[PDB]
Amino acid sequence: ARFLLLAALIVLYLLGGAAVFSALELAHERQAKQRWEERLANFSRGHNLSRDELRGFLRHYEEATRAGIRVDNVRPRWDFTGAFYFVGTVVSTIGFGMTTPATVGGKIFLIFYGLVGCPSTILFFNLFLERLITIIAYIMKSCHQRQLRRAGWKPSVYYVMLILCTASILISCCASAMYTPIEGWSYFDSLYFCFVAFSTIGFGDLVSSQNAHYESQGLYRFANFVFILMGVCCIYSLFNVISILIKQSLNWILRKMDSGCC
Amino acid sequence: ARFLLLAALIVLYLLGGAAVFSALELAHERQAKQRWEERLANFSRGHNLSRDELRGFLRHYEEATRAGIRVDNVRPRWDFTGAFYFVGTVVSTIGFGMTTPATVGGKIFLIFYGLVGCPSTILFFNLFLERLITIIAYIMKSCHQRQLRRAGWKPSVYYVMLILCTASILISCCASAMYTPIEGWSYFDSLYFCFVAFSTIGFGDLVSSQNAHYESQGLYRFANFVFILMGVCCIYSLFNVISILIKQSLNWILRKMDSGCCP
């Protein structure tokens, strides 16, 4: 059993999550598909355009979007800045999917590039964790010394966790307040995008600065880069910290189960 | 300086990688854009269809594809099996992007779901690392005992790394040999997809089983699930192992630099 057989609860947990996900908005999905098909009929009707023509045109439009032609006026998907953003997505393992290589040489170069750089950035996130723990312990010593005269301390996993999620939500509010007037999203939409990007998931449904023109383009790009870096660092730190916290809790509950149900 | 100022080489390294990426196929991108615009002109011409109509139609077709209408006949993006695949993408932090929530309730539920489940799977990958190390040390003891009579051993990071990338490439060949006759990709394309999915990146340009119909649908789905799980586990293990290996090497080179260049 041990920590190891937690996969039973894991599989049950994806099962339950999938169930509740399905029940909560299958209605939305049916409505979307129905209304999409309805305008398909409408658009074919009002333009006298056959179904095979739409078949081919939409298929190969999807091909070209895979080549990176986001329908609104966007940046060149890939340049010095474009390849910089692409690689920054790659090494951090976000995988937004807005920029993907097309040539087999680019593909195999990406294979080597990921293999030799993604662990480097994961370890750099680990180094950021080490810095944050050390510096926060130092400032805790400083605050204690101040209130007395006015690893080291090794702050507990609980308090480290609490202040870590506090920093996470705070930087989420700052990032949202900087994105919303620019991207034009909503506050909850920007929060969701921040969580997706910082948690390494990178769905790509909502993506950061991609338009061709932005006010103070260089400054905005630098701010977006530093915000994404800090957010992903803090969220990865929180992920590891609550990982060890929940494994402590799981060991505790398994010990209780073994002692009671002997 | 320490391990900490490695960010200088890191930024230089993304800079150089971006440069070589750009130089190596900006030609391909220009050609793609030019030929795409050219058929745009052609298609508007041969159907007498204005530019604003295409503007709206393509914009909101992208909206509906964001709702999940992959143009080829695909599975219902999201069902018991669909939400299962969606969540399996979520918890493993792959983020393929083929399935995304649309309602704000679904969004906030995904916030809690990720926050409370993604670290669980990262720690489960850590547990898989611990199992693999322990079991491989046990089999190394077994092989040593066999050849003598016919942490424990704690295999070194170098040999663990070597056999770990060996297992990675092997499972890559098996996954590619099982995907290529089904998905219809190429061998190098399937290798690239396997690396993308196993390395947590999950671009979504090439995605696993999504068509509505597959031969032996249940068996194929189970095989895809177990293959993806094993591949991502092995690749994450390799990532951590070479992370510690390159930090050893970086400490070594920094010590050399500090000893030689002593200011």
Ligand SMILES: [K+]
């Ligand atoms: K990821």
Ligand SMILES: [K+]
């Ligand atoms: K990802």
